[PDB]
Structure 1
Amino acid sequence: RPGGDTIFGKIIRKEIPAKIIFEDDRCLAFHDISPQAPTHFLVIPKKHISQISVAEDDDESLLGHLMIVGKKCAADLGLNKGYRMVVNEGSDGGQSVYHVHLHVLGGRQMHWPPG
């Protein structure tokens, strides 16, 4: 099954419901079920890549597309004071789902350090 069987692969194939913000042939943006800010969504590739550390050189356009879609969705959601984009890698990064994903958080002041 295209996208794999992580929760995110299931969401891509409409097998598990999600609150979808934007969808194209390359990616999907949807709200996080455990939000850490008043607005907290995810942008994921439809292609399954387990983690950023194994992304290939030719994935550059796709990874950049996640950011472009993320910033467009943030504007569409009225995050006019800004937002934070996060990619978690591995154990120290706090990655819990091994399908690459970009978090976008806003609607409150984000603090430093970022975790």
Structure 2
Amino acid sequence: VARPGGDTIFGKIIRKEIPAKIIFEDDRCLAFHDISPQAPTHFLVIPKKHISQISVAEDDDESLLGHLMIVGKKCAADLGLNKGYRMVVNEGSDGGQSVYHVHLHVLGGRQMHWPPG
């Protein structure tokens, strides 16, 4: 109970223990810029609830997961991404996941290519 939300880097960002460049915050989620951007704009939307990866999300996490996408789309509009953007979730080893706290990437400000990696 000392630190709700765990000790991943993202858990610590939630608790203001590690700095981040915050775009939006509510009771359910946090949006902040990615430190290693892959596009001119590249941010993350994460739940405040710690979930390691999708593949272990519960059925009752549906509205939270959907909220990540709604917040991502609103933040994209607030950031002027008027030509569009790509949303990405990386699951596990083959997805390239590196932080085991669920997160949605939002990338834009350039033409995104196909395939998506």
Please give the per-residue CA displacement for 1:12-67, whole angstroms capped at 9, x wherever unaligned. 00000000000000000000000000000000000000000000000000000000
SS, match of residue 30 in structure 2: strand
What is the CA distance between 1:3 and its match in structure 2? 1.4
What is the CA distance between 1:92 and its match in structure 2? 0.1
Query: What is the percent sequence identity of the aligned residues?
Result: 100
SS, match of residue 40 in structure 1: strand
> What is the CA–CA distance in structure 2 between the aligned matches of 1:55 and 1:69, rounded to whole Å?
19
Please give the per-residue CA displacement for 1:50-89, whole angstroms capped at 9, x wherever unaligned. 0000000000000000000000000000000000000000
What is the CA distance between 1:2 and its match in structure 2? 1.3
> What is the CA–CA distance in structure 2 between the aligned matches of 1:38 and 1:3, rounded to whole Å?
30
When normalised by structure 1's length, the TM-score is 1.00
Q: How many residues of Structure 1 are paired with residues of Structure 2 in the alignment? A: 115
Please give the per-residue CA displacement for 1:92-114, whole angstroms capped at 9, x wherever unaligned. 00000000000000000000000
SS, match of residue 44 in structure 2: strand
- Alignment correspondent of 2:94: 92
Unaligned runs of 5+ in 1: none
When normalised by structure 2's length, the TM-score is 0.98
> What is the CA–CA distance in structure 1 between the aligned matches of 2:33 and 2:5, rounded to whole Å?
18
> What is the CA–CA distance in structure 1 between the aligned matches of 2:31 and 2:94, rounded to whole Å?
25
Question: Root-mean-square deviation (CA), in Å?
Answer: 0.3
